[PDB]
Design a protein around this ligand. Structure first.
Ligand SMILES: Cc1cc2nc3c(=O)[nH]c(=O)nc-3n(C[C@H](O)[C@H](O)[C@H](O)COP(=O)(O)OP(=O)(O)OC[C@H]3O[C@@H](n4cnc5c(N)ncnc54)[C@H](O)[C@@H]3O)c2cc1C
Length: 419
């Protein structure tokens, strides 16, 4: 029933071997969890989606990994309530295609659409619209969680199991297997954005543009960011901002199928773009090529943020692929990554000294009240991680109640002592 398989995250690093269960039969999934539990726990089990997380949260060396991609049924779609009821293995591209004809839009879309609903919830993913829509967890209306007792429980964000619900959001699969969920989509009349572009010349200008109140005029905003140029050109950015377009805003040609599926001059106003145009290596060149690194610094620590940016460019580790964004308010999930503040993802070529240097970055992010993202990490320590997440003891306490025998476990769980 299972296949022994070498697994890595997307960055192709830190391999380990698991027995992988891959079945479309939910009852086989239920049985397998029971078998792990009735064996007393052992090396446990963890769900896996499309493996787009960069780190080691979707693998479990010497244990069971359940590939959830065969559970990919969209059970229902409701345009009045905006609710969509889908198996956890359905991916966002599939959901986007299925929901567009109903005038519904996936409420949080990350950099790639090849992620499962299960992985979207488990990592509480964020997108270009975080400051207006929060993260993926914000839009979960309910979910069915297969817990260690072999029971599938219906969780809601305000019901009696609210605590377990919010521990499951951002929980990295460690409260159990999400089987199915109900997502509240965002109403839309088109599959297009109307975008404004602006280019800044310095970190100070990038920061000023994000704090001048203009951000409140756009639902989506992010920026490509310069991390190599010495100051004052350090931190200059190419900012892409916009919102979903209405049909009347569409070019005449495009108005017939409005819900169709799919330096200096980078300044513009009212550009009409589809998803691909509006939104836009490690796998191709890994694990030898690149270390991805993502962090957020609280809004009020703006000078600490600039310092870290300064430290990065002076390091001699140079990243071209940089994404920057001002996060909005956080949600109630103890281990949710986003907090309001300055978010940046960088991508360092793997070079001598890199490891020691990012360990120093860790220290700075931590001291300044910031955090790393589990979906981008395969290397930090338990000590650093627990320190970045003041609600980790609270979260661990929920996990112990719902999984006393540690039926659910992963390489990440052991590394960061979340087990
Ligand atoms: C090119 C690229 C761009 C990206 N951009 C973004 C971005 O803009 N914003 C962002 O927030 N993230 C981004 N990510 C990270 C990605 O969105 C998250 O890692 C997401 O969790 C991946 O989903 P997945 O189905 O591949 O899950 P996997 O990587 O397979 O698993 C990730 C975690 O989810 C858990 N999980 C998966 N399915 C279930 C389930 N059914 N039940 C319980 N737990 C489950 C796993 O146990 C694991 O802990 C990006 C990744 C890549 C490769």
């Amino acid at each position: 029933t299972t296949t022994a398989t070498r697994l890595t995250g997307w960055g192709r690093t830190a391999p380990s071997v698991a027995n992988v269960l891959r079945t479309p039969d939910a009852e086989m999934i239920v049985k397998a969890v029971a078998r792990v539990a009735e064996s007393g726990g052992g090396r446990g089990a963890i769900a896996r989606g499309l493996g787009r997380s960069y780190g080691d949260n979707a693998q479990n060396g010497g244990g069971l990994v359940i590939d959830m991609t065969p559970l990919n049924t969209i059970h229902s779609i409701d345009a009045d309530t905006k609710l969509v009821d889908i198996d956890a293995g359905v991916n966002l591209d599939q959901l986007m295609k299925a929901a567009l004809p109903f005038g519904l839009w996936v409420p949080v879309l990350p950099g790639t659409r090849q992620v499962t609903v299960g992985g979207a919830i488990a990592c509480d993913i964020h997108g270009k619209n975080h400051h207006s829509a929060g993260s993926f967890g914000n839009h979960v209306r309910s979910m069915d969680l297969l817990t260690a007792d072999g029971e599938i429980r219906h969780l809601t964000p305000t019901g009696e199991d609210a605590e377990l619900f919010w521990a499951t959001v951002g929980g990295n699969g460690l409260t159990g297997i999400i089987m199915r969920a109900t997502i509240e989509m965002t109403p839309t009349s088109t599959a297009y954005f109307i975008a404004d572009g602006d280019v800044t010349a310095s970190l100070d200008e990038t920061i000023a543009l994000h704090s001048d109140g203009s951000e409140a005029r756009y639902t989506y905003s992010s920026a490509w960011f310069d991390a190599i140029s010495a100051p004052p050109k350090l931190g200059r950015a190419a900012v892409s901002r916009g919102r979903l377009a209405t049909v009347e805003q569409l070019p005449a040609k495009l108005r017939s199928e409005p819900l169709k599926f799919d330096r200096k001059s980078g300044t513009y106003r009212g550009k009409v773009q589809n998803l691909t145009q509006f939104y836009h290596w490690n796998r191709a060149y890994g694990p030898a090529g690149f270390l991805q690194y993502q962090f957020v610094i609280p809004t009020e620590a703006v000078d600490e943020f600039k310092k870290i940016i300064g430290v990065i460019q002076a390091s001699g580790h140079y990243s071209f692929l940089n994404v920057f964004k001002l996060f909005g308010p956080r949600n109630q999930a103890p281990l949710s990554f986003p907090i309001p503040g300055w978010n940046i993802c960088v991508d360092f070529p793997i070079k001598d000294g890199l490891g020691k240097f990012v360990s120093e970055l860790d220290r700075r992010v931590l001291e300044f009240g910031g955090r790393l993202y589990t979906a981008k990490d395969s290397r930090t320590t338990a000590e650093t991680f627990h320190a970045m997440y003041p609600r980790v003891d609270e979260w661990i306490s929920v996990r112990r109640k719902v999984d006393p025998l540690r039926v659910f476990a992963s390489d990440m769980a052991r590394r960061l002592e979340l087990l």
